[PDB]
Amino acid sequence: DNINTLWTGVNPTEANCQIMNSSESNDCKLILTLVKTGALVTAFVYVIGVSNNFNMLTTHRNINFTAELFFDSTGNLLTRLSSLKTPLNHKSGQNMATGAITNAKGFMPSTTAYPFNDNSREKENYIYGTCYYTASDRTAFPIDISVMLNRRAINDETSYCIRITWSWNTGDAPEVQTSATTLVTSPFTFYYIREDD
Amino acid sequence: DNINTLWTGVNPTEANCQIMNSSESNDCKLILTLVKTGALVTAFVYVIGVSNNFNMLTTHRNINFTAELFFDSTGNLLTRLSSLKTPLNHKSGQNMATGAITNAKGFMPSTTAYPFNDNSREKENYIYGTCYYTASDRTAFPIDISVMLNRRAINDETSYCIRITWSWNTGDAPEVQTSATTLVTSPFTFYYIREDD
Amino acid sequence: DNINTLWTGVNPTEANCQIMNSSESNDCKLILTLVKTGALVTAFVYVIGVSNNFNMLTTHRNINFTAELFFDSTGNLLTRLSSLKTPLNHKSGQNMATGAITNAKGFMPSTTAYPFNDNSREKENYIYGTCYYTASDRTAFPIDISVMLNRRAINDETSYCIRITWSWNTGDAPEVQTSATTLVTSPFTFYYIREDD
Amino acid sequence: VLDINDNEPVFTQDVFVGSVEELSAAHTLVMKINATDADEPNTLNSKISYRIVSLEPAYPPVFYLNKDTGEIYTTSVTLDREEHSSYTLTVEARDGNGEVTDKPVKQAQVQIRILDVNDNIPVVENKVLEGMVEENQVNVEVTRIKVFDADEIGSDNWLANFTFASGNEGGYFHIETDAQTNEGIVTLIKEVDYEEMKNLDFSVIVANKAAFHKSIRSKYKPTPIPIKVKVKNVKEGI
Amino acid sequence: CEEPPTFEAMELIGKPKPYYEIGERVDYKCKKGYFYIPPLATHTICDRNHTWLPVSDDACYRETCPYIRDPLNGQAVPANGTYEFGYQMHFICNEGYYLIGEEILYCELKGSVAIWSGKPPICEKV
């Protein structure tokens, strides 16, 4: 009964997500897990920096970066448009399974609760929260997280959309030139009503 | 096997909850979902403003409104006492299922974890958190949520109680007279130990 | 089918955890629950003060206290070293069942997601959050919580480690000498990727 | 013949000394107290029971002395150096029953110094800051800025490091740090023409020389402190 | 029945009706600031006598304020011998001490919460 999970796998060997719009050759490792809990989906997301440009974000006092996941009518990730460049799959130990996804649609943000192209219900398409970044000196810097759910579809393929934006605006950078090692975000867990299977 | 959900449904057609005691008839739309997760229940709650008076609350600097839910011995909502005026039910698509509730009591807060009229354990009956309101300028205005669980009864029928108090008290209100469109709160998720089925 | 839960039990009759090593005669009551959610485990933790020296902490401006849980390779609590001095077990009503633990290993933090003795991934071993203390005047007091998952082993038996540090550092203490009654912290819920069964 | 508690444990030194860092976690070894005797070890009349006779200032209860081991730890009440810079302890050692009896036993002094950590953000006491620059003058103190910090006097946690938030892109002002009073000496290092009417106001941010402690980092909001600069109109002639 | 009874500490639920058929049941709710303790009933039924069956507001008890411990070198005492709101609490300093703060506190009902009119005082050595 692992078909209730849809994730990128625990610590994939190679980077699997392209976040920084200023670079190519996907530059980070986005660990994402979606768990079906009754009528909700628990989303458990964090990012591990790999490329030097990403890891250098910690040396700046004002950062923002977004992961955009677009899903077709069947809930399969659009690897061409999505920041994540590897399909999600079910739990198989600590790694992704191999095979067709069993009811991927059930993991997607519900169109009814979260609609497209509706300025009257726009405010219902936002979720907010906070995570933390652990510095070298063991300081937990707070990072604001904004999740936009399936509000606007860029193309025809996109049936569902999750946009997770990390941002921070602090006083002194969490790291200096000689101390930045990797930009790991503390896990962020949020909830959203899920589309019918 | 949708029996693990007890919710109001997704975006009910008509307003289903009356919060403002100063108003008559239903004034908002309370979306509440309870998921049975082993030894806990995950509660997922937010409000969609409907009435003009309720929506105008965004213009006032210091506001607080409480949704009261009272449940009898069998866990069925007491309509005449609770702010919500329509019983919860199991999941059926994006709407409420129709029929008797399969073990409603299981979704109710545990009396042992959360007692009644016990002054030595009062502190155990409180949960706190923060939700957010998406302002017209797309900024997140924070709102404080206080949840009080089955501490005090009101008649001979009330066996469990959930009081969800949204509030804020700031120098500037989230909106002004000309911008107030609708009052919707970002979903709030909390957990509580559940009474035995 | 309650095997999905592993908890201390609801409101144990007698103190079951010693946080302050400066004292003996276990000085607190730790309510900790772990529930499987697909590929994650949801942890639901709070503490009830029992001893006088513990309950007097609310009268102080600066406070920090840590609950340490060390679990062996089979997923069983090491009571000799752990702050929690009673084994965890499955849900049998509102109490702990008696017998062997069914797949304790499944509830342990994952070694792959959270490794041992690897500085390069140190930042992956931290989770953060906030709980609350309900004061005599009913004003919520924020308490910071830092959870460290299996970063360092103490002896050859420790296979998994969870250190939950509650702390606060403010200007005024939550209570005064003549008002402090008992230290009960609002439940704190966090998530972690779980080791394979 | 059975050994009896006819003597007392002998402290290895009259005045034990140690130190512990401020904001240290709970249960961190502050010191170890050593005392011995000449009786058969591991017996009722030879086991050494340590006990804190008294603690100055006795409040809050920030230290704990284990009777079986003699090692002094910190407790859940986290230390605060600014409240109490140092602690004195009158300790004693016993044997046999290990309890306090009518007969006194030799007592020792244990002095514990709290080591200061940078857990206080400097603040600018002066609310109205305004200099008066004399025209075309170089290497002249433009003004001074008062900075206060509650951390230990003279340490890197107390000295103020001044940085220019803005208004000095022209390389006109430089701020030195007077460590005698922890103040910022704003001096002018370039010539200014009043006819040019160079708008010389600027804005600076104040921070301690050492990096701020993890308890206050991530809570540091560097509010810019503006300073208005006036330039004298020297009457060269008409 | 033409009159559902009115009580000090318990209010009828819903809009009162001019007349209720024999057997109709009317339920009450403990008033804001009062809380229910079992096993007394909080409802009544209109009998054949056109009289509501006996029901009293003894089920609801008044909200109480937080407990206060005696000030150091002092003595707190419930002025009215209890902690329900609308009542007061008195403080006395021992022979060798004097009071520094408020002599008497008043426990008042703000909304649904009973709170003390200030913080407990302390006694200081003369």
Numbering used by the authors:
A (entry chain B), B (entry chain C), C (entry chain A): 129 to 325
D (entry chain D): 100 to 337
E (entry chain E): 1 to 126
What do the paper's sentences say?
Among human species B adenovirus, HAdV-11, has the particular feature of exploiting two primary receptors, desmoglein 2 (DSG2) and CD46, to mediate cell attachment. In this study, we elucidate the molecular basis for HAdV-11 recognition of DSG2 by resolving the structure of extracellular domains of DSG2 in complex with the HAdV-11 fiber knob protein. The structure shows that DSG2 and CD46 engage different HAdV-11 residues and interfaces without overlapping.
By playing with the stoichiometry of the two receptors, we successfully obtained a “super-complex” composed of the HAd11K trimeric fiber knob with only one molecule of DSG2 and only one molecule of CD46. Indeed, populations composed of rDSG2 and rCD46 alone were detected along with a “super complex” of HAd11K interacting with one rDSG2 and one rCD46 molecule. Indeed, the HI and DG loops of one monomer make extensive contacts with the SCR1 and the SCR1-SCR2 interface and the IJ loop of the neighboring monomer interacts with the base of SCR2.
